[PDB]
Design a protein around this ligand. Structure first.
Ligand SMILES: [Mg+2]
Ligand SMILES: [Mg+2]
Ligand SMILES: [Mg+2]
Ligand SMILES: [Mg+2]
Ligand SMILES: [Mg+2]
Ligand SMILES: [Mg+2]
Ligand SMILES: [Mg+2]
Ligand SMILES: [Mg+2]
Ligand SMILES: [Mg+2]
Ligand SMILES: [Mg+2]
Ligand SMILES: [Mg+2]
Ligand SMILES: [Mg+2]
Ligand SMILES: [Mg+2]
Ligand SMILES: [Mg+2]
Ligand SMILES: [Mg+2]
Lengths: 149, 224, 72, 129, 144, 125
RNA sequence: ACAAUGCAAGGUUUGUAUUGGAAUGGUGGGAAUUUAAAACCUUCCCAGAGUAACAAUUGGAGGGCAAGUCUGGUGCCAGCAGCCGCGGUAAUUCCAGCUCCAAUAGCGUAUAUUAAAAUUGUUGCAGUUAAAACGCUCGUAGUUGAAUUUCAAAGAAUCAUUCUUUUUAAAAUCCGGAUUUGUUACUUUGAGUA
RNA sequence: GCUUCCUUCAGUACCUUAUGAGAAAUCAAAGUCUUUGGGUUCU
């Protein structure tokens, strides 16, 4: 684990066969449409994937549709400006900051806030290095709260 | 010189049931009596005799309620000067007695050391075959094989041991306290021992086994 | 030139002062069950004996021959 | 974390040899590692090995002949010129008569002797005895 | 892990640590600090010429019991006062209370030698005649 | 300016000056071949030693490397000329196998002693 | 140096005290030459060793470390001793004499330096307790960074191996044939260096 | 539904055992180290 002393290995591990299984009836177009609908309804990539797995009969959008789900969202144009994980981190940070504002003496929270900030800065940096974030994007503790939306 | 042999191997060796000490080495047998070793290296019959030396007589004190109580550790290296080296230790009250004990110990120890070659094989092996390294206590020594004309580059004690072993040409190292002579000697011995137990591209061959003295002559031992 | 003995299991090859290491000898059968004259042989190094894998090694060796039949 | 897969693999192999295993599961296969293994096989030290393809970094399992004394990586893959080789080999491997010092060389990976024969030295991966 | 970095491009760290650490080596520090030239009577030299100021005794280290015969001399070079032990069975009297003595080290760089407490110097010539020669006596006699 | 007439030490000292065995060996050598010091022995060792070093270096190179064939060959030839090897033992692995006796044999005094002329080594000298 | 006897030891020969003829530099003087002129070098001719006075020293002999528990003197004094130590009336250590040992026309002492030093550690140190893991985490530079992209295949020579030849895709170029295809590190050949 | 037993994850101790280590005390890490180079910070 990047920050704790946590060393767990709980993980999804996908099956050997990566051409979709026989029982999968859904044609790709339908699944794409479903994905789009889910996106519209406010769900994030991971969440969307989960929904697809559970509510509909489909293991992996990658086996049914050549593309992964983020890619298809992008194609359809409903991709977030601000990437999933990063966004989540930002939200968490914001929450922490609110708590701090409320409740000044919380040392552990402060420590954890610092850690989350650091992680954001890593993630943020990575995104900048690609082209998902713009280069003009620092993350600010003052702004942050407004950013998430 | 006659002695009533106790052990089976010894008994066998008493008569001409064994060719060489090589055979006994092969089947990893525990040599108990120094008499066996003597029999294998006599001045008559045999070629190279066992030249010995008292490399160190260190005095060693126990400190009882009434003063000190000195014993003498003797170390001895024993050596064919060609294949077989041995290293004995004995702590005893008198010096001479200790020395005597140590020679017996050395004989018991006596090991075959593989001499090999540097570069390419010409007449008769001379150095160690590969870098062999023993440790005993702090002192760890790394004999490295050398070309022919080199002598034993190494400490006096190491030179002494190596001549006995029958290595002519070598390169010594020595990490650790070499002033502690006994340990150094032990390390050297260990290194020498390692020479057979190394497993070179030479020895990939799976040659079928020889029969041990104990099965090949079991019938002859039933008489006694 | 004494060529030392190769542990039949692990091939480690075993020196003079090993002891420990053993040349176990297995006697053959001739149709009836009676002791045939011949003897099939395995040297086992000291290390394996110390470990306790020796028995396993022996079993494997037997399997490789025909002497016993289960492997593990 | 991983850094040099190959080094780790070699360490594992060495450990296996020490124990006196027979089989050994080298856990992330790598082209380089495979090449190394092949080389080893060629010079007799290793038996068969069944590079098992997952759908990821593969696993190898490798069949051992009880024959390796040590095998190793020498990290910092030092560039090594053809003249500079001899000293390096003296430093490393136990005898001039045997052992092999494996270079990655612009003519694929090969041992020091091979390199000498060719003419090109290159970067030095590892070795065995 | 080793402790040290063994990267291919690591050289800067490797050099730099060594450069800093060298200074922990006592001998190296003695060689390369500038205080050598400052804080040393001979001022980086084998010998030095000093006129004598006082023939003096120095009591030895506790186990041994002697009064070692020293000569407190002033270096002409440096204006430094130093005790220099004089060898010989009876070689204090071979020198005068004011004689141009040529004094060497004792054998241990600065570090003091043997029974003597803090006398780091061995007079080895008086009025240009060799102390050793005088001691032998068959060779020479002190000119004055 | 300084002259350019460069000059060189012919003999290295021992290292360990009161090793018994070595000393005894040296003395024996002196006895046998009528030599004045240990210096002579040292000089001859040095002479031998350079050659040996060269041989070693050559052996580190492979056969049909130009240097090895040329320089090595030259060395061998020189040895032959000197009376160190002769017919049987001219292969570059052999020039390592030279010892001090081999070299001392070819000293003039030794030769003189051999080929009648004088009753002794000392006499010959 | 050599040979005689005398003496010695060894399984007749080596070794070592009397003699005594041979050898020869050195040293002295002439030349020949050398050299700008001399001087040396070498060269020849006269001179020319037996205590071959034509005289080997230097530093050591407790250990480290080769060599004395030899003789007198000193008496925790003087002194020696790089270090450990020696000296308090047997000093194997001082001061001597004798004998021995080493290196020897050299041999000591000092200061510096290299090696010894894997005691600065790239090769190559150590860090529970010996000196040494920052109280802890984050963190910039720094160093380090999973796997993945043409794998392979066949023929001839040699003593399972070595060295060689041939083809297995795509694009541009040339009259179905034939021939170019990321950058740098790295490496190989060169070139050019007093 | 809880409980046990099996296997397995992540903690986390202990016991025997080291042809493993160590100067030893001891250490499943202090092991895979003169058969010395996985990475890296500090001393
Ligand atoms: Mg981290
Ligand atoms: Mg993990
Ligand atoms: Mg001028
Ligand atoms: Mg001595
Ligand atoms: Mg002195
Ligand atoms: Mg006396
Ligand atoms: Mg005396
Ligand atoms: Mg140094
Ligand atoms: Mg060194
Ligand atoms: Mg250290
Ligand atoms: Mg501490
Ligand atoms: Mg800590
Ligand atoms: Mg960084
Ligand atoms: Mg990679
Ligand atoms: Mg290391």
């Amino acid at each position: 684990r990047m920050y704790g002393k946590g060393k767990g290995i709980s993980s999804s591990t996908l099956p050997y066969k990566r051409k979709q299984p026989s029982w999968l009836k859904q044609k790709p177009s339908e699944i794409e449409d479903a994905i789009i609908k889910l996106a519209k309804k406010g769900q994030t990539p991971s969440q969307i994937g989960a929904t697809l797995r559970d509510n509909y009969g489909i293991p992996q959008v990658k086996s049914v549709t050549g593309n992964k789900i983020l890619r298809i969202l992008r194609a359809q144009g409903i991709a977030t400006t601000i990437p999933e994980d990063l966004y989540f981190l930002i939200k968490k940070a914001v929450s922490m900051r609110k708590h701090l504002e409320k409740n000044k003496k919380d040392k552990d929270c402060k420590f954890r806030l610092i850690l989350t900030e650091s992680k954001i800065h890593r993630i943020s940096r990575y995104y900048k290095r690609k082209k998902l974030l713009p280069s003009n994007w620092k993350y600010q503790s003052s702004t942050a709260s407004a950013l998430i939306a | 010189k006659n002695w009533v042999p106790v052990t089976k191997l010894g008994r066998l060796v008493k008569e001409g049931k064994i060719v060489s000490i090589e055979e006994i080495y092969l089947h990893s047998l525990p040599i108990k009596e120094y008499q066996i070793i003597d029999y294998f290296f006599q001045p008559n019959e045999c070629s190279h005799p066992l030249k010995d030396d008292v490399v160190k007589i260190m005095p060693v004190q126990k400190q009882t309620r009434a003063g000190q109580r000195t014993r003498f550790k003797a170390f001895v290296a024993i050596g064919d000067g060609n294949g077989h080296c041995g290293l004995g230790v004995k702590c005893a009250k008198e010096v001479a007695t200790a020395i005597r004990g140590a020679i017996i110990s050395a004989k018991l120890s006596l090991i075959p050391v593989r001499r090999g070659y540097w570069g390419n094989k010409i007449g008769d092996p001379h150095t160690v075959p590969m870098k062999v390294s023993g440790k005993c206590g702090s002192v760890r020594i790394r004999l490295v094989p050398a070309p022919r004309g080199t002598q034993i580059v190494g400490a006096p004690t190491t030179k002494k041991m190596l001549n006995f072993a029958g290595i002519k040409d070598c390169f010594s190292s020595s990490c650790g306290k070499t002033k502690t002579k006994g340990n150094f000697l032990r390390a050297i011995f260990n290194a020498l021992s390692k020479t057979y137990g190394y497993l070179t591209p030479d020895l990939w061959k799976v040659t079928n086994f020889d029969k041990s003295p104990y099965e090949e002559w079991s019938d002859f031992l039933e008489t006694y | 030139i004494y060529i030392p003995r190769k542990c039949s299991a692990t091939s480690r090859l075993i020196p003079a002062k090993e002891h420990g290491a053993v040349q176990i000898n297995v006697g053959m059968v001739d149709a009836n069950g009676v002791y045939n004259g011949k003897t099939e042989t395995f040297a086992i190094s000291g290390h394996v004996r110390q470990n306790g894998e020796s028995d396993a090694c022996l079993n494997r060796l037997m399997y490789e021959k025909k002497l016993l039949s289960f492997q593990n | 974390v991983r850094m040099s897969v190959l080094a780790d693999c070699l360490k594992t192999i060495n450990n296996a040899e020490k124990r006196g295993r027979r089989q050994v599961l080298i856990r992330p296969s790598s082209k380089v590692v495979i090449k190394f293994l092949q080389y080893m096989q060629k010079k007799g030290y290793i038996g068969s090995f069944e590079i098992v393809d997952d759908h990821r970094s593969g696993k190898i399992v490798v069949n051992l002949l009880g024959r390796i004394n040590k095998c190793a990586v020498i990290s910092p893959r030092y560039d090594v010129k053809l003249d500079e080789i001899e000293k390096i080999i003296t430093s490393i491997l136990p005898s001039r008569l045997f052992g092999h010092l494996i270079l990655t060389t612009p003519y694929g990976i090969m041992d020091h002797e091979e390199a000498r024969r060719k003419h090109t030295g290159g970067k030095v991966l590892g070795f065995f005895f | 892990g080793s402790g040290k970095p063994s990267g291919l491009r690591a050289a800067r760290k490797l050099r730099i640590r060594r450069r800093t650490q060298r200074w922990a080596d006592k001998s190296y520090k003695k060689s390369h600090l500038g205080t050598r030239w400052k804080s040393n009577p001979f001022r980086g030299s084998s010998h030095a010429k000093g006129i004598v100021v006082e023939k003096v005794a120095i009591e030895a280290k506790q186990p041994n019991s002697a009064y070692r015969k020293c000569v407190r001399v002033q270096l002409i070079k440096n204006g430094k006062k130093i005790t220099a032990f004089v060898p010989g069975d009876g070689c204090l009297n071979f020198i005068d209370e004011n004689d141009e003595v040529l004094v060497s080290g004792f054998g241990r760089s600065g570090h003091s030698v043997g029974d003597l407490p803090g006398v780091k110097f061995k007079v080895v010539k008086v009025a240009r005649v060799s102390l050793l020669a005088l001691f032998k006596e068959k060779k020479e006699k002190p000119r004055s | 300016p300084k002259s350019y007439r460069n000059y060189s030490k012919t003999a290295r000292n021992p290292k360990r000056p009161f090793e018994k065995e070595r000393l005894d060996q040296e003395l024996k050598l002196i006895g046998e071949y009528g030599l004045k010091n240990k210096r002579e022995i040292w000089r001859v060792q040095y002479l031998l030693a350079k050659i040996r070093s060269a041989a070693r270096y050559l052996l580190t190179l492979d056969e049909k490397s130009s240097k090895r064939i040329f320089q090595g060959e030259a060395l061998l030839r020189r040895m032959v000329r000197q009376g160190l090897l002769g017919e049987n033992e001219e292969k570059l692995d052999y020039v390592l196998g030279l010892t001090l006796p081999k070299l001392l044999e070819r000293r003039l005094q030794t030769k003189v002693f051999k080929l009648g002329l004088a009753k002794s080594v000392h006499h010959a000298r």
